[model samples]
Target: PESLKKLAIEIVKKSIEAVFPDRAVKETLPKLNLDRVILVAVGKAAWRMAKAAYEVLGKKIRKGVVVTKYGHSEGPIDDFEIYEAGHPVPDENTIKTTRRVLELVDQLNENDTVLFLLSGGGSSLFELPLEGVSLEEIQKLTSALLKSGASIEEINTVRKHLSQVKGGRFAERVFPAKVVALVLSDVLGDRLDVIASGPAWPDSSTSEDALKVLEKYGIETSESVKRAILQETPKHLSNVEIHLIGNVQKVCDEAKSLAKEKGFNAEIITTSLDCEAREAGRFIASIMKEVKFKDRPLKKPAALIFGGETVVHVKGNGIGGRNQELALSAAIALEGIEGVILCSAGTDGTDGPTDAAGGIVDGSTAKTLKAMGEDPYQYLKNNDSYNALKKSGALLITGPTGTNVNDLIIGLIV
Candidate 1:
């Protein structure tokens, strides 16, 4: 079991490293004229991406500001200012830092070049509310949307309407300036409109899309917010270049390749993994069992891999993320089945506001829980997989991985 967990964790680490923006930034830095590069990076991976940029461009960067998730940044990267802020939910620091970024952009001229590093979590990390909307209001809307279990595209559709900087408004702000955005994609299909709400790319979503998302979730808000949601967002931009450096499917592929090297007949079942968290786990477990018994997809000693993100509909007053919920639910389905090991973790090393990256479990995990007088089913039902997985020693804590594409699940049978 230890060996299997080790293998699973190693494969994930490889997947994260393969998509990291270090080499990508290195590859792009020299070619771009860096003499007047004004860098602004925002999202969970902002610090590391900016760090890579600093390593290559150094003092050649004219000015820089990085707004990242709390605890993601170490310190200032060279002369670049660094601000650590909240994620999954925006805090005061998020609002403050974003204002600073907007101010920095305001000072830029037509001759300036903006090196924008964008990644997951930027919907919150790089926020700027429409006029008259308070941070408390925006935070409440974000919390409700997240708990509603909306798809990334759905959530971002609403977000783009309420924010001043999203939906290509950020790029519009840098109009007539040379802008190059190095992006690490977290959304399925790499839809430019959903990844960090498309601050530097054109947006096709409209106010009607935002209204529909609200109706689908039955979300209520102040009339002011509602009116803001109906406002038109920018659909056109010029003098900007967007380059996707990585994504979830690429990460999953790297994991599968590594599993093959470890003597497992690894197969990527789904890279665009969009579903409810628990159902995603259940589906993967059923496939794993089918493979072991029927060998429909692959023989034994196989690794079933998945990528992309899943949403957890939070119905209970409990603490856990989508990855933990997926893994916990799978652990329940895997009960009494021998020789099967599974893990689900966010590639960014943080899953759903918890310190743990995600969860890892084997066939014996449920039995072990019951033997210890803990009811796994109760915890799963309560959306409390963080505590449940922690008790079972199933939580995988890697701290901040310095990168994030999405979530990954790897099931190993040996």
Candidate 2:
């Protein structure tokens, strides 16, 4: 791996640890003024987060349950309970784990404070059925929305409506008790209610929003899914104290530090860029041209960093994530322009479902595509940046990076 790639991976790994409630729980839990504490950790980072909590709090922590993707587990820990579930789609495990989460909440009391270690996959891992929907129906709708390129907000809106544990219900179930939520955000812009479907935070959105997503995605979701959204069990939140312990902002700050150490002028343009991947690519290309060719605000030989999530509509079965699409899409826009290159990756080390966290695109990246007899546009149109980049050996893979802070892109124009 290039130095930049290695640094990116290391920074993300540290970011995950920094957000883990383990140390923070030990340090912060003693201040909660509670007799006992219960934990509910969900997302790809659950095991590590649980490990951190166990190491810090030890037996002082009463007990907890963790839910994560099946193959995404890091072995298991003995003290805390573990349930491996399906992600991006629900399975029997989803239903079973969600029931357990609700059961844990039922065990809470006014004197009991619940610690929520929330990350990106809770929307699926903590899945619980609404009144009339089956796991199969929820799964069908989930697949459709994912394929529709719906934003996290949209996807989670629908998910919240369809689940007993989503929206504001998780907090509702733990009511009268202190709910302290520590989040490692994965949603674009770090929307509290969207990341991991906002287990502990209040929901500002409505079930109608979910219905709108279903209609927009043309999801033939079960009538029950629709009715649940149309007439959802009403619940509101005003008690929980939700805190984002990590996001792209952490990585952007680290990138700034790296620039300072390397003696390069660096500024995080915006850690909140959102658009179609290719469109963002064009916008990034324009920024690079402005810095290099026009030199309006700054001189040449500067790097611009952006941290946020982007989307691909998934026109085909091609494997890739938003970061991969962003890097490839950006390179195609840059074309033969010299003295400039771009790289983007998911902070968690997984973009979409692929092993490559993301990829790099420079002057030679385009040539590499051509040599492989692949037209970047065709692959991009099919939403297959993963294969195209992989075939060219340009994919950047760092498995299970233990952190997810959305996406980050770095551009250098010298």
Candidate 3:
């Protein structure tokens, strides 16, 4: 059990290190040229992305404002104005900070450039309401859709409707001026239109799609909110361009290479992990069991990797993220099996609302929790995987990693 746990942590560390923003930002920033760069970075990786630019641009930057998740701006940052806002849900700070980002962009001229850095949690970190919608309405709609098992694309469809800075509106704000966006994709397929709601690119999603998302979630919203949803998004942006610098595919490849270097036969089985969080977990455990017993997919001492985001239908009033829920569910499935360990974590160093990145569990994890006088099933039912994993000593806590890609899952049969 100790050996498996150690191997799992090594994989997690390598995966995150591979997706850090330093190299990607360095290669991409030099491609742009403008008289003066005004940096407006928003997302979970805003601090790191901005810092990288600070190293390159130095005194060339005229002004900047960075908005990231709360506590995501821990270390030293550039001279830019920093604002830490909410993630998974937008708060009043999101509103105020988003306004400042807009003001900073508005101050730029045609010769000046808008250097926008975006990543996963930007949907909530950077948002402002349409004319009639209130912040309360945005909060209610976001909370409902998040817990409704809706996909990221579906949820962003609704978010684009209610925001002034999303869905290419932010690009429209800097119109007639050059807008260069560097994005670290956290969405599957690396869809530019969905990542950070495609603020620098044209939006293909329409008002009809937004309304359908709300209807699909069965969320009763105010008419003002409905109007915002029914409103049209920008159809074209000639002056703006977006580049995806990193994504889950990079993380998965990095994990596989590191595992192989450690004497295991490593393979990335899948790069699209979108589905129900718990179901994904159980499915992974099933695969690992097959490898252990039947040796169908790969032999023992093998590492299987999967990447992309998973959705969680929040039913219980407990604390956990999609990765935590997935790991807890896998623990139940691998109760007595030996030589098996599973881990699921977000590359951004946050899963759900907790500080823990995700969860890691060996075959004895369930039995360990039971021995600790904890009912794993009850905790899973309550969506309290944080507490259950903590009790079992299966929680994997890494502070904010200053990057955002998506979720990475590793399954081992050794």
Candidate 4:
């Protein structure tokens, strides 16, 4: 049992390392031929990506600013100003840091080049509200959409309209200058306009689409907010060149290879897995059962990998993330099944608001929770998967991985 868990952890580690931003940034730098470039990096991986750029470009970088989530910064790098800000919801620091960034890009000439390193969490890490739309209104809307289990695409569609620096507006500011965006995508299908709300890429979604999302979710907002959503984002931009360096598919590919190396028949179920967290977990568990017993998909000693972001509709006051909820649900379905372990993790090394990345649970995890006098069912009902997984020693804690593609779910049957 411990061996199965250990194997799953190994797969996760190797998979995350495969997609880390260091190598990708280093490789892309030589082609850009940047000379005295102004650097701006935003996301959970901002510091790490910026550090790599600084290491490669050295003093050729004229000036730089890095805005990332709080506690994600690893200290100063050269003369680059690193500011930590709120994520999932933008705060005052986000506005202040973004203002500084706008100042840096202001009045640039055609000869100027701004190296914009973008990644997941950039949507919230770098934001400046449009006039008449207060930051509080944006924050409230973000919170509500997140709790409502709206997909990232749906949430970002709304976010792109209300901000001054989203959906190609950032590119508009750097009109005369060239902007090269190196993105590490967290959104499935790698929609350029959806990842980090596509600050540099021209928005493809219309204002009507944003209002439709609000109506579909039954989200009520003020008249001013509705007016902001009706505002159109830039539909075309000519000064920006975009390159997608990494995504969830890369993570899944690496996991599958590592699983095969460990003597398992590895198969990638899907790289675009989108569904409810609990339902996905249950579906994965059922697949594992079929593989182990029926041997239809794959025989025993098999590793089935899935990659994508799952949504969680929060109903109770509980602390957990989508990955943790998925893992707990799988653990419940896997109660008497042996020789099986499932791990669900966020590549960003955080799940919801918890320090743990996600959860890894085997067949014995539910029994372990019961042994600790905890009711796994009630915990799941309350959306408290973090506590339940922790009690069973199932929390997958890997501090910030400095990179985010999406989430990974691996089911191993042996």
In order, what lDDT does every prediction score?
Answer: 0.85, 0.73, 0.85, 0.89
Worst 10 residues of 2 by lDDT: 12-21
Ranking by TM-score: 4, 1, 3, 2
Cα lDDT of model 4 by residue, 282-401, tens digit? 999999999989985988789999999999999889899999999999999999888999999999899999999999998889998888788898999999999999888999998878
Error of 3 at 40 (Å): 1.3
Least well predicted 10-residue stretch by lDDT in candidate 4: 27-36
Q: Estimated TM-score per prediction?
A: 0.79, 0.77, 0.79, 0.82
lDDT of 3 by residue, 290-385 (tens): 899988598878999999889988889889989999999999999999899888888878998889999989889999888878899898889888
Compare the candidates by lDDT and give the number of the best one: 4
Sorted on lDDT, highest at the top, how do the candidates line up? Answer: 4, 3, 1, 2
lDDT of 3: 0.85
- The window of 10 residues in a row where model 3 has the poorest summed lDDT is 71-80
Model 4: which residue pairs collide? none
